[PDB]
Design a protein around this ligand. Structure first.
Ligand SMILES: *[C@@H]1O[C@H](CO)[C@@H](O[C@@H]2O[C@H](CO)[C@@H](O)[C@H](O)[C@H]2NC(C)=O)[C@H](O)[C@H]1NC(C)=O
Ligand SMILES: *[C@@H]1O[C@H](CO)[C@@H](O[C@@H]2O[C@H](CO)[C@@H](O)[C@H](O)[C@H]2NC(C)=O)[C@H](O)[C@H]1NC(C)=O
Ligand SMILES: *[C@@H]1O[C@H](CO)[C@@H](O[C@@H]2O[C@H](CO)[C@@H](O)[C@H](O)[C@H]2NC(C)=O)[C@H](O)[C@H]1NC(C)=O
Ligand code: NAG
Ligand code: NAG
Lengths: 33, 100, 49, 411, 100, 49
């Protein structure tokens, strides 16, 4: 994998999770990340 | 010709106004008395025939339909954000860098 | 989400939208309405912080 | 009575750079070693202001008075005499005049007549006005007056108060800093859209000394002022120019350490707007009322009710030439931007002399027994000739009109 | 004599009644319509002509100008503080002590 | 410093000085500005605490 990550780390990343995304909606109200 | 005013919606009046639409630019707009500001883009969403406006999960307007022609227009708030200045000690120099 | 939803609350004013408040009547009461709205929004912001 | 000199060599005005001058004491409070932030009218730093030089060479144009005046002069021998604030430069409108004597200063507000070139001319003659008009306010005070003289003044009129702040510096513009201290406040309160100045020259032709001056305009700005151990403003920073000054204002300090600091936001400021509305679509025909095949008599005229219509009142001047068209309540200046409840159309035919009778508060047989109009009637009345259509050689007895009745009719 | 009132500054009345100044005493005073309270003392500040009343870093009046002798008087709030009470249990003893 | 700065804010009232408010306004309808100032100062104190 190009990410240079172990299978355990990849699985941990995967488990954790037209139309506008909620992040964009929050961004469009003066709230940035 | 005599005009009357009663307790009624009073929907007797001629043409309001008309103008041409420009896309991909930040601009104000007023559709059917609904005011807004943003950039207009072609919308791929398929609105139902009776539906005019559109709201996202944030309960804010994100789509609109042209009253003159049955075309769906996507509105997007114009770009904005804070600014920052990166500088060394003033005793060292005076040049600064600007980050958007 | 909460910090967004409080934007749709009247907070005792006529309506959440503010420009309609300015255009509806003269400043001598629109000022009070805007004062109520901004006080509520500032309280919400302080709670969020 | 004045003189015009033909030795004028016209030269375009020059622009000089005001670096850091144009800062005054905001008010009458004493501060000691405190960096204070103020938001008021000040001359922006590194401003691009006008240059006037006379030394043949002579030109004193008139400059606007948008918001305020900052006047500067490097000078010797006290060539400059005073100033005029005149919006028209004649004896019609009000003006204001400041004159510095050899041992006095006089301030006045009234009107005078100014020649094609008013100025002052040992010097025992003085010709700047040719009219003796009455004046309302006047006052007399103690006079204000290599290169050794540097005098700078500021004039601002707001809140019904006109301010006189002056200062002198002993010695393009020098790269230095100075504090401008208040002198006088006055209750004048006049608009002033333009202003002039004064100067003194000695006849040789004529001889002009080293006279030059600069004029700048004030803007609302935020400044940071650093008071020294005394009440002297030794430094000022304007943070509407470059990001470093903005960081200085944010930190409220004259020194910034290494790092990244947040100062302000960013916007787009969109251009123009969209006022789009739907089609006109439903247009109930007004032609059936105006251009009907026939009309009715004034006693039983034709009535039509109009509701839920998109009625365009612009397209009406496309028939017989021109005739009676009088609107009451609503002006004929395209008042279609007002959505009403209902429209009632009353169409009839009357002779020429009875046209005036169809109006509120009119006396006549038609106005009483045929058609009565209320005083509070809002709308319009249109009347056009129809001789070519309603008249026949043998006569047209179809149309009738009522002549007798027991009582008048309600509107 | 004719009296009128219009939309004018109306600056024709003359100064009203005035009293004597008392220093080194915590009193309440009025200075050109400005109300204050404290102790008046001699001021060593270099009050240049047009400076009337000074202020401190906390943005409050520190010195005032007398519009009868053109003298600058420092103002200081009079003595104040907090009181603390030291006492054992009431069921044990009634003697108390205080600390200012 | 922040608390000191909170003494220079009107919170939307007419002035930050009590005597001017009491002298330039009729006391029955001047209570609103004073109450607004009191509420603002109490809120600032609570935030500081
Ligand atoms: C100061 O200068 C003014 C301006 O010239 C003098 O006012 C003139 O006085 C003479 C004689 O008193 C009059 O004939 C002129 O009409 C005045 N002109 C104006 C514009 O006022 C004044 O006399 C000078 N000396 C002072 C004020 O002491
Ligand atoms: C602030 O004011 C004081 C007093 O006027 C100034 O101190 C005097 O400065 C002059 C010029 O340097 C000296 O000749 C005097 O001897 C000083 N007086 C004393 C008592 O030392 C001081 O310089 C001023 N601060 C400035 C101008 O920045
Ligand atoms: C709204 O009015 C416009 C007027 O231009 C209409 O646009 C044209 O209308 C003609 C008939 O009036 C048609 O033949 C064209 O095909 C139309 N062109 C376009 C690009 O639409 C428009 O159709 C009208 N819309 C409605 C809903 O009435
Ligand atoms: C000021 O105006 C002069 C006029 O010629 C111009 O040359 C100069 O570039 C201007 N300065 C700035 C900073 O724009
Ligand atoms: C000088 O100019 C004025 C205009 O203000 C004019 O009336 C006058 O005639 C001129 N003088 C001569 C000698 O033409």
């Amino acid at each position: 994998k190009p990410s240079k990550r172990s299978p355990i780390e990849d699985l941990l990343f995967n488990k954790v999770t037209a139309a506008r995304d909620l992040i964009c909606a929050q961004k469009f109200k003066g709230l940035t990340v | 010709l005599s005009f009357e005013l009663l307790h009624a919606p009073a929907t007797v009046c001629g043409p309001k106004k008309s103008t041409n639409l420009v896309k991909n630019k930040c601009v104000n707009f007023n559709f059917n008395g609904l005011k807004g500001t943003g950039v207009l883009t072609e919308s791929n969403k398929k609105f139902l025939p009776f539906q005019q406006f559109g709201r996202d999960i944030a309960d804010t307007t994100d789509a609109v339909r042209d009253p003159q022609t049955l075309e769906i227009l996507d509105i997007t708030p114009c770009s904005f954000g804070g600014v920052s200045v990166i500088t060394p000690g003033t005793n060292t120099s005076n040049q600064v860098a600007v980050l958007y | 989400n909460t910090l967004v939803k409080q934007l749709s609350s009247k907070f005792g004013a006529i309506s959440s939208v503010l420009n309609d408040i300015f255009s509806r009547l003269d400043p001598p009461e629109a000022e009070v309405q805007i004062d109520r709205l901004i006080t509520g929004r500032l309280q919400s912001l302080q709670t969020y912080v | 009575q004045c003189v015009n000199l033909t030795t004028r060599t016209q030269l375009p005005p020059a622009y000089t750079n005001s670096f850091t001058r144009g800062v005054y004491y905001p008010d009458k409070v004493f501060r000691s070693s405190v960096l204070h932030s103020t938001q008021d009218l000040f001359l922006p730093f590194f401003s691009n202001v006008t240059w006037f030089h006379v030394i043949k060479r002579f030109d004193n144009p008139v400059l606007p008075f948008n918001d305020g005046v900052y006047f500067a002069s490097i000078e010797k021998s006290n060539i400059i005499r005073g100033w005029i604030f005149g919006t028209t430069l004649d004896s019609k409108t009000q003006s204001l005049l400041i004159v510095n004597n050899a041992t006095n200063v006089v301030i006045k507000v009234c009107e005078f007549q100014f020649c094609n070139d008013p100025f002052l001319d040992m010097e025992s003659e003085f010709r700047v006005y040719s009219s003796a008009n009455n004046c309302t306010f006047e006052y007399v005070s103690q006079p204000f007056l290599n290169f050794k003289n540097l005098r700078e003044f500021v004039f601002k009129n707001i809140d019904g108060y006109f301010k006189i702040y002056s200062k002198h510096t002993p010695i393009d513009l020098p790269q230095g800093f100075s504090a401008l201290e208040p002198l006088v406040d006055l209750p004048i309160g006049i608009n002033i859209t333009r202003f002039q100045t004064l100067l003194a020259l000695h006849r040789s032709g004529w001889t002009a000394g080293a006279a030059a001056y600069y004029v700048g305009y004030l803007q609302p700005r935020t400044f940071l002022l650093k008071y020294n151990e005394n009440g002297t403003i030794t430094d000022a920073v304007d943070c509407a120019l470059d990001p470093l000054s903005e960081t200085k204002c944010t930190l409220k300090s004259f020194t910034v350490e290494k790092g990244i600091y947040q100062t302000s936001n960013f916007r787009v400021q969109p251009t123009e707007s969209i006022v789009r509305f739907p089609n006109i679509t439903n247009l109930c025909p007004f032609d059936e009322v105006f251009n009907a095949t026939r009309f009715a008599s004034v006693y039983a005229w034709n009535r039509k009710r109009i509701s839920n219509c998109v009625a365009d009142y612009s397209v009406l001047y496309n028939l017989a030439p021109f005739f009676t068209f009088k609107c009451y309540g609503v002006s004929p200046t395209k008042l279609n931007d007002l959505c009403f409840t209902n429209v009632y159309a009353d169409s009839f035919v009357i002779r020429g002399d009875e046209v005036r009778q169809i109006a509120p508060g009119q006396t006549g047989n038609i106005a009483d027994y045929n058609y009565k109009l209320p005083d509070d009637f809002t709308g319009c009345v249109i009347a056009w000739n129809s001789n070519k259509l309603d008249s026949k050689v043998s006569g047209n007895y179809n149309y009738l009109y009522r002549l007798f009745r027991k009582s008048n009719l309600k509107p």
